[PDB]
Amino acid sequence: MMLPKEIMMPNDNPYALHRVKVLKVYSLTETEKLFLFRFEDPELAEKWTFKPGQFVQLTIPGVGEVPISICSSPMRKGFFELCIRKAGRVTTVVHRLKPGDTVLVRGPYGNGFPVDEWEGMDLLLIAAGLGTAPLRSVFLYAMDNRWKYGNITFINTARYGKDLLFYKELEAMKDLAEAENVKIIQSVTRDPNWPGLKGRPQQFIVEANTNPKNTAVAICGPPRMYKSVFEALINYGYRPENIFVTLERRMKCGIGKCGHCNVGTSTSWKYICKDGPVFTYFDIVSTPGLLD
Amino acid sequence: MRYVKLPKENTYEFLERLKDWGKLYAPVKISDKFYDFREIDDVRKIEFHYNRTIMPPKKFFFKPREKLFEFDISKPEYREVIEEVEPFIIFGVHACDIYGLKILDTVYLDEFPDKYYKVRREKGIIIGISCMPDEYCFCNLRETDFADDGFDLFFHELPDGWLVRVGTPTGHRLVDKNIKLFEEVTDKDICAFRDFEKRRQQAFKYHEDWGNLRYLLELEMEHPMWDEEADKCLACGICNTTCPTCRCYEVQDIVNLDGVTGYRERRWDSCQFRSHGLVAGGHNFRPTKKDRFRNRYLCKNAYNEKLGLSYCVGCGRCTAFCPANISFVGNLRRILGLE
Amino acid sequence: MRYVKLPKENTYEFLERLKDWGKLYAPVKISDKFYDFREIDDVRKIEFHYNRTIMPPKKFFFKPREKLFEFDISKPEYREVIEEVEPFIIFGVHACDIYGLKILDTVYLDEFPDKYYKVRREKGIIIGISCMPDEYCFCNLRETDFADDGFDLFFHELPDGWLVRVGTPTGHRLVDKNIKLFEEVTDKDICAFRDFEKRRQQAFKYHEDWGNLRYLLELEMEHPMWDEEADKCLACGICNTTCPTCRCYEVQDIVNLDGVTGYRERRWDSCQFRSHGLVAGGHNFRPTKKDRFRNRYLCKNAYNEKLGLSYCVGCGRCTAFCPANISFVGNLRRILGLE
Amino acid sequence: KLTALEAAEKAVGFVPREEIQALREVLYIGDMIESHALHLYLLVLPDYRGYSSPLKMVNEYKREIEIALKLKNLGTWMMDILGSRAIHQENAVLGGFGKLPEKSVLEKMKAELREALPLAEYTFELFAKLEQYSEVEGPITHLAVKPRGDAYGIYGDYIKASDGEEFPSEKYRDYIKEFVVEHSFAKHSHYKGRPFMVGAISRVINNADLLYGKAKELYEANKDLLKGTNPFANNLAQALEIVYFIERAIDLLDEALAKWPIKPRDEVEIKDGFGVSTTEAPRGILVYALKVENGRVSYADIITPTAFNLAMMEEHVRMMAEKHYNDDPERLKILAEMVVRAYDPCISCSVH
Amino acid sequence: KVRIGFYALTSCYGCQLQLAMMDELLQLIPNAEIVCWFMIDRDSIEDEKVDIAFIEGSVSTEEEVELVKKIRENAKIVVAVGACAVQGGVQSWSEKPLEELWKKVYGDAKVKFQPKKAEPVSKYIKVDYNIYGCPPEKKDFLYALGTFLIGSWPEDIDYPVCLECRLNGHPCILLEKGEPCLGPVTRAGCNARCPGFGVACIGCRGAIGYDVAWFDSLAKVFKEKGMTKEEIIERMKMFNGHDERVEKMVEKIFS
Numbered sequence A: 001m002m003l004p005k006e007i008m009m010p011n012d013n014p015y016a017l018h019r020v021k022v023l024k025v026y027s028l029t030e031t032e033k034l035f036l037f038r039f040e041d042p043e044l045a046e047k048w049t050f051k052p053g054q055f056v057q058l059t060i061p062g063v064g065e066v067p068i069s070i071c072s073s074p075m076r077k078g079f080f081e082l083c084i085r086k087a088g089r090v091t092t093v094v095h096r097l098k099p100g101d102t103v104l105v106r107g108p109y110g111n112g113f114p115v116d117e118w119e120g121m122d123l124l125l126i127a128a129g130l131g132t133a134p135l136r137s138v139f140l141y142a143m144d145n146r147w148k149y150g151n152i153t154f155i156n157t158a159r160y161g162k163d164l165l166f167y168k169e170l171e172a173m174k175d176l177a178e179a180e181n182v183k184i185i186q187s188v189t190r191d192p193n194w195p196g197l198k199g200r201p202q203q204f205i206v207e208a209n210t211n212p213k214n215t216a217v218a219i220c221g222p223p224r225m226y227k228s229v230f231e232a233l234i235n236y237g238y239r240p241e242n243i244f245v246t247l248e249r250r251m252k253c254g255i256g257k258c259g260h261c262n263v264g265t266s267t268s269w270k271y272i273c274k275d276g277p278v279f280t281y282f283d284i285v286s287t288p289g290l291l292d
Numbered sequence B, C: 001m002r003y004v005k006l007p008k009e010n011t012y013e014f015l016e017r018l019k020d021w022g023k024l025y026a027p028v029k030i031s032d033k034f035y036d037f038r039e040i041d042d043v044r045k046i047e048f049h050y051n052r053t054i055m056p057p058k059k060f061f062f063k064p065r066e067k068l069f070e071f072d073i074s075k076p077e078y079r080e081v082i083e084e085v086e087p088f089i090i091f092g093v094h095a096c097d098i099y100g101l102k103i104l105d106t107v108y109l110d111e112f113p114d115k116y117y118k119v120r121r122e123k124g125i126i127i128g129i130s131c132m133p134d135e136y137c138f139c140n141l142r143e144t145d146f147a148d149d150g151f152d153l154f155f156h157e158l159p160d161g162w163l164v165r166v167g168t169p170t171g172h173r174l175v176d177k178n179i180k181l182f183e184e185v186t187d188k189d190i191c192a193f194r195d196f197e198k199r200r201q202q203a204f205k206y207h208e209d210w211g212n213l214r215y216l217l218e219l220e221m222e223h224p225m226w227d228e229e230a231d232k233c234l235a236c237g238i239c240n241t242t243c244p245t246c247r248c249y250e251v252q253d254i255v256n257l258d259g260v261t262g263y264r265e266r267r268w269d270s271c272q273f274r275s276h277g278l279v280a281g282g283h284n285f286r287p288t289k290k291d292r293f294r295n296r297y298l299c300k301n302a303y304n305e306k307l308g309l310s311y312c313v314g315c316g317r318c319t320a321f322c323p324a325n326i327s328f329v330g331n332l333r334r335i336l337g338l339e
Numbered sequence D: 001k002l003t004a005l006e007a008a009e010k011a012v013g014f015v016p017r018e019e020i021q022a023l024r025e026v027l028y029i030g031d032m033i034e035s036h037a038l039h040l041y042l043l044v045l046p047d048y049r050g051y052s053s054p055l056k057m058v059n060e061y062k063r064e065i066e067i068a069l070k071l072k073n074l075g076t077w078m079m080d081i082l083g084s085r086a087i088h089q090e091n092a093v094l095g096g097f098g099k100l101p102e103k104s105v106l107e108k109m110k111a112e113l114r115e116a117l118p119l120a121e122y123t124f125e126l127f128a129k130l131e132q133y134s135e136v137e138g139p140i141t142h143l144a145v146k147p148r149g150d151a152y153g154i155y156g157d158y159i160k161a162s163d164g165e166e167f168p169s170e171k172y173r174d175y176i177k178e179f180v181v182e183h184s185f186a187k188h189s190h191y192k193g194r195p196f197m198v199g200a201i202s203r204v205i206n207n208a209d210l211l212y213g214k215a216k217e218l219y220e221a222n223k224d225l226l227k228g229t230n231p232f233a234n235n236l237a238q239a240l241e242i243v244y245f246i247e248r249a250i251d252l253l254d255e256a257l258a259k260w261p262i263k264p265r266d267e268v269e270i271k272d273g274f275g276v277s278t279t280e281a282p283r284g285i286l287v288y289a290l291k292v293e294n295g296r297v298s299y300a301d302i303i304t305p306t307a308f309n310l311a312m313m314e315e316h317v318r319m320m321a322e323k324h325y326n327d328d329p330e331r332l333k334i335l336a337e338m339v340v341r342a343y344d345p346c347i348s349c350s351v352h
Numbered sequence E: 001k002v003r004i005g006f007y008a009l010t011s012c013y014g015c016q017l018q019l020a021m022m023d024e025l026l027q028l029i030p031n032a033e034i035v036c037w038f039m040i041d042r043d044s045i046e047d048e049k050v051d052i053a054f055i056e057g058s059v060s061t062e063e064e065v066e067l068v069k070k071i072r073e074n075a076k077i078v079v080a081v082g083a084c085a086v087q088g089g090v091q092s093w094s095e096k097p098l099e100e101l102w103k104k105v106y107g108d109a110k111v112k113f114q115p116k117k118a119e120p121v122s123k124y125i126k127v128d129y130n131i132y133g134c135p136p137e138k139k140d141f142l143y144a145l146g147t148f149l150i151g152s153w154p155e156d157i158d159y160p161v162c163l164e165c166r167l168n169g170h171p172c173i174l175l176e177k178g179e180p181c182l183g184p185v186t187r188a189g190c191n192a193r194c195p196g197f198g199v200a201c202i203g204c205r206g207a208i209g210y211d212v213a214w215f216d217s218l219a220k221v222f223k224e225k226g227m228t229k230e231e232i233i234e235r236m237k238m239f240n241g242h243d244e245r246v247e248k249m250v251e252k253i254f255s
């Protein structure tokens, strides 16, 4: 968002960090934990609002900072949630955080999904692997604002059945969601012994309950699945002007100075922290190299 | 615009008077062939006719190695390390370096203004000087040869003195405080300025139009030239650490030996290094040396929306200071088919 | 960027398909030697190889004569005259005219957006075309020869068809709706594009750098050239009324014969006319013809902060359409001392 | 580094300028200050003060550790300014230095040496208060270098002995024999068939009359302790040498500043030759014999002070152990270790 | 308290001396418990359980291979300190076999102790982290010890000395005098000491890992300035004598 004096401090320092406390730790998968945070400043906690799809810079003191997307809805005011996978140094230190500990956060950064201009149209969310958390934010924003959006579909896929993000929440939500114009599809790709569904999301796009001409599509996951998902969506009649995807590059600041999250070419040179992380379909089509 | 003439015998007196405003940084000779911006104690050390500096003028605002925060790990607290910056004068800035400073201002004085950059940018007085082209200078191709703004005083070379352009109120104050040393510009000095401009335009090595360079670079990303020139590359990053318009930095948190205190550090980075694109899990978005080598060309030839220029200004530091004798302009002209 | 190719035998079919998106405006021949942007009913009338139009492309957004308001003098009320602007396609815009449209966008959409300009600018699709310069074109000196953005489709001339650049989602939709008529770009088409760019660069009359033109104009406002060229001037204003980047308009309130109703009208204005700088009491801030003649040069050579280029794009309309045979570029080069 | 530079310059037939030699002597004095202060305060002080580690002596003997750190930092800072670093100096090139510091840095170095002279005095007093064990009293053959010039120093062309005779540096292997024992990777040395000692105490005994200043005053006062018979006088001799070398470094800095500005390095062309340089290390005589053939090293011979001292160490540990025979094993171990540490042994230089 | 043990293989003790001469080492005593460090401590036990083991020196004795296997058994983290432990040091400059060197130095005599050619510690055990230099910088020790005390680990360096050389504004010796500077392939952290003193880098900190040390480009640059192949190979193998990349990469450019 455009929060003043709390996103850049009264000292006008964009690198200034806010003190937050971890209240709940929940292990989703083996290398995955869901963290519930709140700002130790009550006014800052009550004033901090974000957009679905935006990210924050989580500074573990003495180790470094990492960019994490927000998975909770912005209308759950006071608290925000982060889902973090153990990939290396900083995340190894993060996974040792027990409730009641204090960590530093600045944000929110980037542009989220344009959920304000998605008013009065269907929602199709396609989440692969770790991309469920930003789409969890979008999904919970849609569920809190159900009267605004039409039929919504949530496709969540993972390599194994134990690596599905928010499997318990989405499985518990499926009842009364099927009656509330919400369809949840959860599938695995490399697990042929999984009792549930199997296959890639492009197989389950046909099983969606969304009107193809009036649907907003949000895709999050590895860059390699994007081309196949684009082919499937274009074949079924989803308009290319409504397809949105998220990309990841190396980030050190999140404000546009370190120059590490660069994509594109000399014709269209862009930065993830300033021009994304949400990109449109035509941006992905025009310049190669944004995928893989 | 206000035009004043500084006679040849009052130049050193004016430079001495510039020390009353603050610290004076002017180009001096650090080795037999290399220059740099160093602090002035003796005014006779200033080299008015130099080609380029071993370090760009961005080192005064975008410092090469800077301490951002000091922290206590117990009671998590990051305290910003900003000192009171006193006014200083950067003398001898070429027009290409002035445009590079403007480009870096667009990068670092954006919607999130960098406090460390802005504090030092406020207190800096940029006095520009004229120059004669070298074999490595192509600022005419990038349109950074004549500066419009971004300075306070600009010194133009005349046979019998200098011509001073005043662009800001700070330059007006500098001229009006030492008005005893300045004179009035006649038609003869204007004619001499015109002659110097003609000679400067004649002294450039290349005279070409590079409008379609970005699109040809996009269309020719699978050229054999990239492999050929990347096999020569040392991955030393001098082309980025000496580039005036390179924004990249690397951050590191250093913990003191007590385990409680420490600091966060910021240093210049290069895209030629392996870890510039490493994204954890082993994936590098520029995994080969050819990829990083081409990424530098793509980044430098990109278009700056706020200014209308490329991020490359044309100083030739990447070509002159390359230890592997790799020509940036030569490879760009290979892409354009002009060789 | 998308680099689709249009074969030579599908060009007229694609132009016919463009009429499904709205009204098509393309350059046609109005006289033996003059062109203009006119509405297309027969597609064979489009002249793909033309030099310039008698009227700039700004007439579709900054209309030559427009009715702003209608009013009732009793119970004073001014009602805006805004009509529903249906989408239209402007085909054949040269790169200089695209840059001129960008400059006029900066003028008319900066802080108080012009509603009349904006409602027509948002509904216009700018399809650009390549060109071969003639003796009057100096768009390479003003750096408006190759377009970066501001278009949806750009047609590049090939011996066996066209090369199409897609820079907007609207151009993406235009290409994807008629993808049957388009093909894939090979290395041969890229080589042909490179050859055409080399030939276009070789076809320009002047190859000079004009960095210090503004400062030389400022220093030489008392030149005999101004008197000798103003004595030729007819004060007909064609150089302003046929200039793509001229913002000036004159307003007038016309009262109907009932004495109660009326309208407020807007038309293109020229600084060469007496009343452009005339204030009450008889004081004109450009009182002599020489003053207005010099003011046009000063205004056109000024620097645009938002874009980074001059307000003159280099189309040559002021030189080609001057009935008194006054050369704009010739006078500018005389100011620079290049004559 | 400096002995190798001396050997290489002798081999290639090059003579350094006087100011460059003075700056090299200042760097060598910095090495001697650091090594002697480090030895005295962190290796032979804790076993005299009843500890097992200098890190356990932070609260009780605070002032002693503070002066230790100040002396060590002075030596380290001299080496950082002149050489590239305190360990493995890189600024010392063939024919001079790669880059010499500014004049104000040399003035600051002189001021810090002046400030550190009282610390050297306190160190000498503290180590004079200690004890020389009488179990190791015996006649010692002391070998030391004859200084070049007319002052106590490190560079020399002749090697003196307590027996009175003196031989040229290049003729060292005619009088010193290197033999390999079956219990150590080092070569023991013999002088006329008998073990001998090199070090600070040998330096004092051989070249005492060349001292000048507070060092000569302290030596004349405490000559009774500095008898060339007890190996435990080596620590006190090291303290006396610190006292001398601070003033010597001040004087050398004055000599160098008399000839400012100084060109950092002379162009040396590598002709063939054979150079032997015997400079006096903090622990004794260092012999470097290098033969150069077509810009390359063809023959290298290094004899280090600890290799010289090992045979005398064995003999004196034998007499100490026979004096403290059949006692408690811990007491014998600690006293034998103190005898060994009196020789400031560098085992690394023994094997080289 | 973190249990730290410093062990000495065949070394000059430069790394232990560098750690001992730091004034910040006094801050390590209240936060860490030093188990084995014979240079400063006398009550140190060799066979004890240590949280972090710092190993100095090359493996030039069979008893040293037994010691390093014991250390790997007894340590949760094994850190190799210095060029001797990381890449064999300058002792691995010569490729001549052990018996030739032994005959040249010690003659035909017996010592009863078994030596071996200098090899890095990584050949006999698994070193989790490395500290580079000869001796390593005080900043490297500070960063490593502090990150270990916080529970993290140091970041490996994959950038050359040229980065710190260009941050400090040092004149480039390779561009001016044509000197054989190994800086473009040597790991940073020394703040460009030798190029700042007018000397050329000899690569004490070691060549960059992760296969991004370009000896072929540097060999071509040296070849343009008139150096034979063997001179370049010896220069690069001064501290990188156990590197298999150097010979292949130089012979590629000289073929």
Ligand SMILES: Cc1cc2nc3c(=O)[nH]c(=O)nc-3n(C[C@H](O)[C@H](O)[C@H](O)COP(=O)(O)OP(=O)(O)OC[C@H]3O[C@@H](n4cnc5c(N)ncnc54)[C@H](O)[C@@H]3O)c2cc1C
Residues within 6 Å of the ligand: A055, A064, A065, A066, A067, A068, A069, A070, A083, A084, A085, A086, A087, A088, A089, A090, A091, A092, A130, A133, A134, A247, A248, A249, A250, A251, A252, A277, B278, B279, B280, B281
């Ligand atoms: C917009 C965005 C949203 C993200 N959202 C999530 C999320 O919801 N959950 C989650 O588990 N992870 C997320 N990540 C990835 C997360 O940032 C990385 O897992 C983390 O930065 C790597 O930590 P590490 O300890 O492995 O660092 P190391 O591998 O040790 O590397 C150190 C530095 O590398 C950088 N880095 C490494 N990988 C990445 C990366 N993928 N993106 C950016 N910087 C990187 C960081 O600056 C980090 O400090 C997101 C990344 C981006 C760019």
Ligand SMILES: NC(=O)c1ccc[n+]([C@@H]2O[C@H](COP(=O)([O-])OP(=O)(O)OC[C@H]3O[C@@H](n4cnc5c(N)ncnc54)[C@H](OP(=O)(O)O)[C@@H]3O)[C@@H](O)[C@H]2O)c1
Residues within 6 Å of the ligand: A069, A128, A129, A130, A131, A132, A133, A134, A135, A157, A158, A159, A160, A188, A189, A190, A200, A201, A220, A221, A222, A223, A224, A225, A226, A228, A229, A246, A247, A248
């Ligand atoms: N957090 C966010 O909101 C967000 C947003 C954007 C990006 N991301 C990034 O996206 C990644 C998430 O994915 P992940 O790394 O966890 O993936 P992964 O599980 O390791 O592999 C991709 C998964 O998608 C399946 N898949 C489906 N269609 C595919 C196709 N066409 N090509 C390839 N795989 C396809 C794969 O099947 P196979 O195993 O058979 O290939 C596998 O199950 C993370 O890097 C995450 O940070 C996250």
Ligand code: NFU
Residues within 6 Å of the ligand: D035, D281, D282, D283, D284, D286, D304, D305, D306, D307, D346, D349, D350
């Ligand atoms: N002093 C001393 Fe050394 Ni480490 C011995 N033996 C070499 O000079």
Ligand code: SF4
Residues within 6 Å of the ligand: B232, B233, B234, B235, B236, B237, B238, B239, B240, B272, B318, B321, B322, B323, B324, B325, B326
């Ligand atoms: S300066 Fe030359 S050798 Fe070094 S990284 Fe740049 S292109 Fe490669």
Ligand code: SF4
Residues within 6 Å of the ligand: A259, A262, B240, B243, B245, B246, B247, B248, B269, B270, B271, B272, B295, B296, B297, B299, B300
């Ligand atoms: S990406 Fe490379 S060229 Fe671009 S600013 Fe960063 S370091 Fe410079």
Ligand code: SF4
Residues within 6 Å of the ligand: B239, B242, B243, B244, B245, B300, B311, B312, B313, B314, B315, B316, B317, B318, B319, B328
């Ligand atoms: S790319 Fe080269 S010429 Fe361009 S600004 Fe950077 S250093 Fe200068």
Ligand code: SF4
Residues within 6 Å of the ligand: B051, B052, B094, B095, B096, B097, B131, B132, B133, B134, B136, B137, B138, B139, B140, B144, B145, B313, B314, B315, B316
């Ligand atoms: S690039 Fe242009 S402005 Fe810069 S030093 Fe060279 S000639 Fe002067």
Ligand code: SF4
Residues within 6 Å of the ligand: C232, C233, C234, C235, C236, C237, C238, C239, C240, C272, C318, C321, C322, C323, C324, C325, C326
């Ligand atoms: S077109 Fe020519 S004659 Fe007419 S007003 Fe312009 S300059 Fe004068």
Ligand code: SF4
Residues within 6 Å of the ligand: C240, C243, C245, C246, C247, C248, C269, C270, C271, C272, C295, C296, C297, C299, C300
């Ligand atoms: S002042 Fe004259 S030249 Fe300038 S915009 Fe107005 S009419 Fe055009």
Ligand code: SF4
Residues within 6 Å of the ligand: C239, C242, C243, C244, C245, C300, C311, C312, C313, C314, C315, C316, C317, C318, C319, C328
């Ligand atoms: S001044 Fe003349 S050449 Fe320039 S834009 Fe106007 S009409 Fe075209």
Ligand code: SF4
Residues within 6 Å of the ligand: C051, C052, C094, C095, C096, C097, C131, C132, C133, C134, C137, C138, C139, C140, C144, C145, C313, C314, C315, C316
């Ligand atoms: S000025 Fe340039 S772009 Fe415009 S018509 Fe002439 S050649 Fe074409």
Ligand code: SF4
Residues within 6 Å of the ligand: E011, E012, E013, E014, E015, E056, E057, E081, E082, E083, E084, E085, E089, E090, E133, E134, E135, E136
């Ligand atoms: S790495 Fe260097 S300083 Fe450390 S022990 Fe080996 S030779 Fe000595």
Ligand code: SF4
Residues within 6 Å of the ligand: B236, B323, E161, E162, E165, E166, E170, E171, E172, E173, E174, E175, E181, E182, E183, E184, E192, E195, E201
């Ligand atoms: S002197 Fe050596 S380390 Fe410094 S920039 Fe040149 S090659 Fe790199």
Ligand code: SF4
Residues within 6 Å of the ligand: D090, E134, E161, E183, E186, E187, E190, E191, E192, E193, E194, E195, E200, E201, E202, E203, E204, E205, E206
């Ligand atoms: S410049 Fe090279 S040799 Fe000198 S300290 Fe640094 S890494 Fe070691």
Ligand code: FES
Residues within 6 Å of the ligand: A250, A251, A252, A253, A254, A255, A256, A257, A258, A259, A260, A261, A271, A272, A273, A274
């Ligand atoms: S994260 Fe630094 S530029 Fe985007």
Ligand SMILES: [Mg+2]
Residues within 6 Å of the ligand: D187, D301, D302, D303, D304, D352
């Ligand atoms: Mg020997």
